[PDB]
Amino acid sequence: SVLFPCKYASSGCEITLPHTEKADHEELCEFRPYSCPCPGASCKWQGSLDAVMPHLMHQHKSITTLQGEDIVFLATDINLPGAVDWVMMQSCFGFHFMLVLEKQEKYDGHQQFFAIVQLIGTRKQAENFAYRLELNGHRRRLTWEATPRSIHEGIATAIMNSDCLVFDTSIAQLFAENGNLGINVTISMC
Amino acid sequence: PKEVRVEPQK
Ligand SMILES: [Zn+2]
Ligand SMILES: [Zn+2]
């Protein structure tokens, strides 16, 4: 029944909790710094939520934005060697969503793809949305639907748990044109 | 419902 201030009180939290509860809150706390939501381990930026979009605009100029709830994410050059990243932004319902495609090295020459959407917003806000990722090919279709992650949470855990759209190179070839992959992204509200 | 060519991060 002794109460401790949140470690992010200096940033404005005002929550005080029993030690039993302290870390569980501090992991979820809105006043926790946001890390750069871009894929890969190159950018080490951190800041508040309101600083994220300007950051992305200053430091990640190549990232393109599309307005609309229903768009096509065309990842080019998917067979180009290494582990690689694709990222773009989708604007709708008064929010920005980051679309990420990530290629990883798996067991042998075989590689795996992970595709996922994050909300540029809080976890609570993230709960109001759903997204759908669609791969389309000749007489085929692969679909993944879920709740977007808040960038507060990030995608490392989701991707690690296959909690996103997961497919490997052979799957990729079925849906690819040239060396490019079209991903249909549809956002909706719950 | 448009499309966007996205190149690898680099
Ligand atoms: Zn707090
Ligand atoms: Zn960054």
CSV table of N, CA, C and O and ligand atoms in Angstrom, one decimal, chain A residues 36 43 45 55 60, ligand 2:
chain,number,residue,atom,x,y,z
A,36,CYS,N,12.0,5.1,-33.1
A,36,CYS,CA,11.7,5.3,-34.6
A,36,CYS,C,11.0,4.0,-35.1
A,36,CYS,O,11.4,2.9,-34.8
A,43,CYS,N,18.3,3.4,-37.5
A,43,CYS,CA,17.9,4.6,-36.9
A,43,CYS,C,17.6,4.4,-35.4
A,43,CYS,O,16.8,3.5,-35.0
A,45,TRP,N,16.7,6.8,-33.3
A,45,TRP,CA,15.9,8.0,-32.7
A,45,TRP,C,14.9,7.6,-31.7
A,45,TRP,O,14.3,6.5,-31.7
A,55,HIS,N,10.0,13.8,-37.4
A,55,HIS,CA,11.2,12.9,-37.5
A,55,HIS,C,11.2,12.2,-38.8
A,55,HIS,O,12.1,12.3,-39.6
A,60,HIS,N,13.7,10.5,-42.8
A,60,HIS,CA,13.3,9.4,-43.7
A,60,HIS,C,12.5,9.8,-44.9
A,60,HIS,O,11.4,9.3,-45.2
C,2,ZN,ZN,14.2,7.2,-37.7
